[PDB]
Amino acid sequence: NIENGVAHIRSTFNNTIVTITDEFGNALSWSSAGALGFKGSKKSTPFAAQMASETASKSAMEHGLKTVEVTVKGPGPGRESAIRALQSAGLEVTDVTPVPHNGCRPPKRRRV
RNA sequence: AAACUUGAGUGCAGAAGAGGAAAGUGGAAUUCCAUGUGUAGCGGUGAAAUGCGCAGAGAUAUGGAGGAACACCAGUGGCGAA
Numbered sequence: 001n002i003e004n005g006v007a008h009i010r011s012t013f014n015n016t017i018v019t020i021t022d023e024f025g026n027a028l029s030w031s032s033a034g035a036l037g038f039k040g041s042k043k044s045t046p047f048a049a050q051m052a053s054e055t056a057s058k059s060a061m062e063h064g065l066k067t068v069e070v071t072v073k074g075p076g077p078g079r080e081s082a083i084r085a086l087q088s089a090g091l092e093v094t095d096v097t098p099v100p101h102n103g104c105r106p107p108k109r110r111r112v
Numbered sequence: 113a114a115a116c117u118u119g120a121g122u123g124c125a126g127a128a129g130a131g132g133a134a135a136g137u138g139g140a141a142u143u144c145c146a147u148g149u150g151u152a153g154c155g156g157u158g159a160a161a162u163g164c165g166c167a168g169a170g171a172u173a174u175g176g177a178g179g180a181a182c183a184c185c186a187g188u189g190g191c192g193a194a
């Protein structure tokens with residue numbers, strides 16, 4: 001039984017991943033678009049992200065979690081959908097996208 | 113040959129600068145490593161597959177190693193012969 005928690009959202013252009021934990025960082029339940037049998041372009045849709053945070057939150061509340069914080073990441077479109085649905089699963093809502101200070105060289109641009 | 117001070121230098125008084133060389137200090141991020149939680153995919157594309165993963169990945173939290181580069185400031189802004 002844990003009541004205070006943190007919800008991590010990792011939304012990219014290929015997949016949305018949600019991990020729920022306390023403030024101590026130890027996870028309790030996670031889901032993703034792939035865990036719901038979505039493949040490819042389906043795995044990145046904003047609708048398909050909400051089906052993942054809803055699944056994740058229901059498992060964390062089963063442990064007894066009521067208040068969870070939000071840490072969002074990535075430019076994936078499944079950001080509002082995965083965050084609003086956090087408040088839509090009986091969870092009380094009380095940006096961590098890594099930016100470098102000019103560090104490592106990024107890969108070459110794609111000539112599609 | 114002799115004068116001159118405008119050109120060109122010097123002196124004096126101010127100011128600005130990513131100009132150069134050397135040695136130090138620091139924060140973010142990437143990768144790898146370890147540890148704790150924790151479970152079924154992660155990753156990737158037009159769509160896929162190769163690839164990694166149940167021997168515990170990816171995610172998350174903490175710590176460590178190492179190299180490289182210096183967000184914001186930042187501007188037909190500045191400096192330099194290039």
Ligand SMILES: [Mg+2]
Nearest residue numbers: 124125126127
């Ligand atoms: Mg002077």
